[PDB]
C-alpha cells in the first residue's frame, strides 16, 4: 500500500540551509501530487506548496516563495523541500502527503521531520 | 475530577551534579483551568517553575499537568519544607502534597 | 484569495450530544472541502472526502454542505473525539484551512 517516509537534518542554523526528502512508495509516484503541510509546535496546518512530478509543475503559497524550493526526482520516487535562509519562525514539524482519490486533498500521511533553527 | 497530586524529591545522582529538582504532577483533573503553587517553608515561590499542561487525554477527557520547580543544592539544602498545591475547580481547599526535606 | 472562517473557536460536549462545526467559505467552492481531525502529537486525519463522502473507517457521523457553507455533523460524540479538526478548500491553490478545537465536558 501506500507509504510516505520523510527524514529531514532536523537540526539547523539560522541562516544556513537544508533538504528535506519525501520517498513514496505503493503508488505510481508520477500520478498524483504532492503537497508539503507544516505544523507549529501546537499550532495549525499551514500550506506550503505543491509539486506534481509528472512533469514537475510547482505552485506555491506567496508567504513560502523563497524559503521554500519544491523539487522532484522521476528515477527515485523522492519529493524534496529545501528551506534555505532559516531564521527561528521555521521551527515546526513539515508534513509531504497526497490524497488517495481527490489529489488536493490529503488522504495518506508521511511521519513528518521536526526541524529546529 | 479531582487532580491526583504526587510530589517527588530531586534524585541522588542530582544532588550529587550540584542541583535540585521537585517534580509536581497533577493527573486525571478537569476542567483544564487549574494552577500550581509552590511553598517553601511556607512562602509562594514561583521563580524556576516551569509548567506544562498536556491536552486533553484520548481515554477518559481529562488533562494532566507538570509543574517543576529548578533550585541549587545550596538554595535546596537551605530550606526544609515544599509544598505543591494545586487550585482547580472541584474544591475550595487547594489540594497540598509537602514534604520535608529532613525526612 | 480564498479564506476559511471557523466556528466555534472551542466548544465543550457532553458524551452522546450532536454538533456541528461550521466552516465559512469567502468564495464559492462548490464542494470541495474536506474534513479532517488532529489529536494529540498527531498529524490531521482525513474524515470525509468532498463535501458528503465516507472514508475508510472513520465513524459514520460526518460530512454536510456546499458551496460557501459547511458543516461538520457529529452524531454521538465519544471520548476519543477530543481533538482539532481542520477544513480545507482544494478549488484555489492558495490550499487555505481553518480551526476548531472539540473538547468534552
Known amino acids: 500500500q501506500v507509504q510516505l517516509q520523510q527524514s529531514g537534518a532536523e537540526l539547523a542554523r539560522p541562516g544556513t540551509s537544508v533538504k528535506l526528502s519525501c520517498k513514496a512508495s505503493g503508488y505510481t509516484f508520477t500520478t498524483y501530487w504532492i503537497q508539503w503541510v507544516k505544523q507549529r509546535p501546537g499550532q495549525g496546518l499551514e500550506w506550503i506548496g505543491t509539486?506534481?512530478?509528472?512533469?514537475?509543475?510547482?505552485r506555491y503559497t506567496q508567504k513560502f516563495k523563497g524559503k521554500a524550493t519544491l523539487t522532484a526526482d522521476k528515477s527515485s520516487s523522492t519529493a524534496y523541500m529545501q528551506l534555505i535562509s532559516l531564521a527561528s519562525e521555521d521551527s515546526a514539524v513539515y508534513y509531504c502527503?497526497?490524497?488517495?482519490?481527490?489529489?488536493?486533498?490529503?488522504?495518506?500521511w508521511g511521519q513528518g521531520t521536526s526541524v529546529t533553527v | 475530577a479531582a487532580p491526583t497530586v504526587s510530589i517527588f524529591p530531586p534524585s541522588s545522582e542530582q544532588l550529587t551534579s550540584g542541583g535540585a529538582s521537585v517534580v509536581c504532577f497533577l493527573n486525571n483533573f478537569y476542567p483544564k483551568d487549574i494552577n500550581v503553587k509552590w511553598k517553601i517553608d511556607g512562602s509562594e515561590r514561583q521563580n524556576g517553575v516551569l509548567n506544562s499542561w498536556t491536552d486533553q487525554d484520548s481515554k477518559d477527557s481529562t488533562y494532566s499537568m507538570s509543574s517543576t520547580l529548578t533550585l541549587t543544592k545550596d538554595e535546596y539544602e537551605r530550606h526544609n519544607s515544599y509544598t505543591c498545591e494545586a487550585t482547580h475547580k472541584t474544591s475550595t481547599s487547594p489540594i497540598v502534597k509537602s514534604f520535608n526535606r529532613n525526612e | 484569495d480564498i479564506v476559511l472562517t471557523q466556528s466555534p473557536a472551542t466548544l465543550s460536549v457532553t458524551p452522546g450530544d450532536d454538533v456541528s462545526l461550521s466552516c465559512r467559505a469567502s468564495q464559492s467552492i462548490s464542494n470541495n472541502l474536506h474534513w479532517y481531525q488532529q489529536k494529540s502529537h498527531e498529524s490531521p486525519r482525513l474524515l470525509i472526502k468532498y463535501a458528503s463522502q465516507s472514508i475508510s473507517g472513520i465513524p459514520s457521523k460526518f460530512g454536510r454542505g456546499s458551496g460557501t457553507d459547511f458543516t461538520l455533523i457529529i452524531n454521538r460524540v465519544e471520548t476519543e473525539d477530543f481533538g482539532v479538526y481542520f477544513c480545507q478548500q482544494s478549488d484555489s491553490w492558495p490550499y487555505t484551512f481553518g480551526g476548531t478545537k472539540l473538547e468534552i465536558i
Open positions: 502527503v497526497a490524497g488517495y482519490d481527490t489529489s488536493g486533498t490529503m488522504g495518506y
Open positions: 509539486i506534481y512530478p509528472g512533469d514537475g509543475d510547482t
